[PDB]
Amino acid sequence: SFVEMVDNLRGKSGQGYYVEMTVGSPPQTLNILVDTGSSNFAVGAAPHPFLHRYYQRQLSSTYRDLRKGVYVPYTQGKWEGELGTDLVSIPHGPNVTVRANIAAITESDKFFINGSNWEGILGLAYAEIARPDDSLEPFFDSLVKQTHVPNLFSLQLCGASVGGSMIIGGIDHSLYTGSLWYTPIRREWYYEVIIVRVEINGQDLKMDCKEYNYDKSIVDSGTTNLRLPKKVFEAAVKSIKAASSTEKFPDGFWLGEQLVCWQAGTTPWNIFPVISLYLMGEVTNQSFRITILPQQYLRPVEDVATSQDDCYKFAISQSSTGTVMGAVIMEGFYVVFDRARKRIGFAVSACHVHDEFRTAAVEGPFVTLDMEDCGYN
Numbered sequence: 001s002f003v004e005m006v007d008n009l010r011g012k013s014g015q016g017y018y019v020e021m022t023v024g025s026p027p028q029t030l031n032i033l034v035d036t037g038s039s040n041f042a043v044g045a046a047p048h049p050f051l052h053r054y055y056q057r058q059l060s061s062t063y064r065d066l067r068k069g070v071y072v073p074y075t076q077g078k079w080e081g082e083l084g085t086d087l088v089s090i091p092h093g094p095n096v097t098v099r100a101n102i103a104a105i106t107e108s109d110k111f112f113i114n115g116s117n118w119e120g121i122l123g124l125a126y127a128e129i130a131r132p133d134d135s136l137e138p139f140f141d142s143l144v145k146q147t148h149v150p151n152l153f154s155l156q157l158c159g160a161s162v163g164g165s166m167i168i169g170g171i172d173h174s175l176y177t178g179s180l181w182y183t184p185i186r187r188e189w190y191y192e193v194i195i196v197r198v199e200i201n202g203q204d205l206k207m208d209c210k211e212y213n214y215d216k217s218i219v220d221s222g223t224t225n226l227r228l229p230k231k232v233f234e235a236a237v238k239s240i241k242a243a244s245s246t247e248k249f250p251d252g253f254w255l256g257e258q259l260v261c262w263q264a265g266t267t268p269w270n271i272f273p274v275i276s277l278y279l280m281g282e283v284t285n286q287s288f289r290i291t292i293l294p295q296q297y298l299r300p301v302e303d304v305a306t307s308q309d310d311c312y313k314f315a316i317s318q319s320s321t322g323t324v325m326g327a328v329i330m331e332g333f334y335v336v337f338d339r340a341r342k343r344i345g346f347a348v349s350a351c352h353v354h355d356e357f358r359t360a361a362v363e364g365p366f367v368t369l370d371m372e373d374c375g376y377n
């Protein structure tokens with residue numbers, strides 16, 4: 001019955017992926033961004049210039065006020081509002097209704113996006129990072145507690161205006177090819193994983209692997225970019241610059257600020273390297289790699305110019321809070337958040353990114369000694 005959830009996600013490039021949900025009685029329909037990088041379910045509940053619609057608690061007979069405030073500061077953007085509970089369903093999801101915590105957003109700053117078609121966010125990570133504290137049960141925990149939906153979900157995020165699937169409660173085998181490779185969830189707060197090796201065009205970055213996970217590494221569907229700790233970011237940009245020095249790039253391109261364009265169909269993909277991320281595996285001394293194409297880390301953006309060229313922004317950003325495997329890493333992979341078994345699986349997606357002579361891959365097994373030394377603490 002997972003077929004009912006295939007293609008249940010939509011979005012705009014750089015702006016997240018959202019699924020349709022209803023809250024309250026009678027049901028109020030809202031588009032909700034799916035975010036494995038946080039743990040609060042929150043919806044616009046007051047007018048805002050960028051909201052097409054919002055949750056009206058007054059109109060729901062099943063609304064309950066928790067008489068408690070809340071706020072969430074993300075890496076960029078924040079909101080504040082009022083806690084309460086209500087009945088929640090996912091029309092293209094399992095056939096259930098659950099009473100869940102909901103933060104009614106009453107003020108926000110740089111959270112909602114102009115012209116955006118989503119009105120709220122579904123934090124799919126664990127209670128440990130829920131605001132105001134870990135006693136506010138996250139939506140997925142309520143779903144599993146109140147129904148027989150199995151304790152896992154999977155995400156197929158597709159590039160090119162974007163779509164994909166969130167399969168709630170399982171794995172749909174028609175959405176990926178090849179084998180699923182699993183990496184442990186190190187700790188249940190973020191979806192934290194451990195990266196044990198990095199290569200660019202087959203060349204090892206050769207850093208202390210602790211640097212790759214300083215101070216954590218997470219899988220985060222609510223962040224567009226690959227974000228890398230300062231030292232890793234610099235090494236990676238240096239290597240990518242070198243590989244592509246054939247061409248010249250504007251100022252701020254490598255900062256993700258300025259875009260670069262080529263005549264339509266002439267993007268020199270070949271001079272941009274693949275990036276391989278090796279992840280800790282399920283058995284001793286064993287890892288696997290996912291290989292990322294430049295078509296993933298050069299994000300397509302519309303040309304505000306009179307030209308109809310292919311333009312892109314560099315979708316790798318420097319971080320001061322650890323590695324973030326964002327949407328452009330997840331795109332073209334099928335990612336299984338197996339909460340029940342505390343692991344995350346990766347396989348080549350059915351909607352994989354295409355390149356003339358290279359392909360995104362998930363490959364294993366590899367041997368990697370002393371993998372536990374890669375985790376930060």
Ligand SMILES: CC(C)c1cccc(CNC[C@@H](O)[C@H](Cc2ccccc2)NC(=O)[C@@H]2CCC[C@H](C(C)(C)N3CCCCC3=O)C2)c1
Nearest residue numbers: 014015016037038073074075076077111129220222223224
């Ligand atoms: C809440 C706690 C646990 C917390 C605190 C700090 C970091 C984290 C790690 N997860 C972050 C996500 O939950 C959050 C999700 C988000 C969605 C929509 C708007 C804003 C944030 N995303 C971000 O903060 C990102 C930082 C880089 C710029 C990102 C921008 C380009 C802006 N962005 C917004 C729309 C979705 C795609 C996107 O890329 C947002 C978690």
